Amino acid sequence: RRWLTWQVMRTGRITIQPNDPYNPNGLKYVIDYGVTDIELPLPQKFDAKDG
Amino acid sequence: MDKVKLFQTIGRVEYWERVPRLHAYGVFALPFPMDPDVNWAQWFTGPHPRAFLVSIHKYGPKAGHVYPTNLTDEDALLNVIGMVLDGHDYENDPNVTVTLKAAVPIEYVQQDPQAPALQPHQAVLDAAEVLKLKVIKGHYFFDYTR
Amino acid sequence: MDKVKLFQTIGRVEYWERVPRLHAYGVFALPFPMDPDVNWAQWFTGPHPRAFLVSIHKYGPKAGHVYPTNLTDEDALLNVIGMVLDGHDYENDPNVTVTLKAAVPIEYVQQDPQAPALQPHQAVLDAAEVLKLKVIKGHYFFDYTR
Amino acid sequence: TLKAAVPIEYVQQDPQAPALQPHQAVLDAAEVLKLKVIKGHYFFDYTR
Amino acid sequence: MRVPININNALARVRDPLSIGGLKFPTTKEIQEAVAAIADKFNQENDLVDRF
């Protein structure tokens, strides 16, 4: 439960593969939710400084 | 994608409004039977209002039936009887109310079925002299009564 | 004909039962990846119940993915793995529940996508020893575990 | 045990072969030893 | 000018009632419906000029 919900808090798509650790069946699921822009861009970070 | 399908449209009604005309010009429309050879489906398909031009069979076996004119045949040019306004139920009625006298804007007449919607069809304007159309401002003036 | 249209049917649905099996033989089913290159819409059309033997890739870029066997593809012949019994949402799920040890009647196994309804397919009977089948009475007794 | 279903991870044919890791010579002799591999888990019925 | 529709009944109409597809038998499910209605509230009109 916590890993499924953290997968969509982290990226926004549940993408389990046939070579996952705890996928012995090897199912292929690319459940995509289409969260629009998952990350806000910064060309420079807060701790970036000069002078 | 796989187990969650996102929002995705099913259908699209695009309700338009019917072709206007001059109040102060009058109107004179007559019912005609329709030529069954020509595919009247693919003329009345679009939701946008159009007004194409029809021509009668002056002689021949299907005389009295009307077909939409093709701008290369001279017999359809010399026998144009009017335009059909906004729409008509083709599949549930084999007859048509053809307006023989009206005053339609030039934006709303498209001779080919696969024409740009709400655009002045240039091949109609280029040959409007033979078709007895007298463009004045932005409108076609026509009566095929004589 | 034109103004008063008669009764014409516009849609029929056709419900069936699922493919039965023997109680005393035991079911044993596993899930599997599905090859995307197979038109899985084709194999799941007809609502009359059919089953079809499914192979698995040995290696390569689609290893573990499953695909319906063709009797000239010897790589599909040597790697037959089971049989999907019933219908399945091909568009809502890329993973099917292949049944491995079961006993299904001879009338409900089809291998062409243009198959008849409920008819004993002849090509799966004429090569029932290389697809590891043993038609005992009227039933396909198979076990792809060993 | 004659008929069971054990993972590939837990079949070690050599006593000095590393545990918790699939032994390769068992897989390269899977047909002679009549072990069918379908997943991780092996399958064998030497009774039939 | 709106499209002349009854929205409550039109939400009932959209469901294809036959709907046997992949599973070869009618599934179980649960349906929710909602009537959006978009507008354009930034094409305002000149309220000031008739004070002058």
Next chain:
Amino acid sequence: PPYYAIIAGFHGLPQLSGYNTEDFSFHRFKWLKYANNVQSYLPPFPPKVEL
């Protein structure tokens, strides 16, 4: 040969509740990279006891 077994599991999937209705976008949570190096402003952690 007597044995004993326990099976366990569930069915489920996380559902995103809200969606925009004009366009079909989703905006409730977003990520961000604010600090380039901030491990220097953090105390160290004790190691794991591999007994």
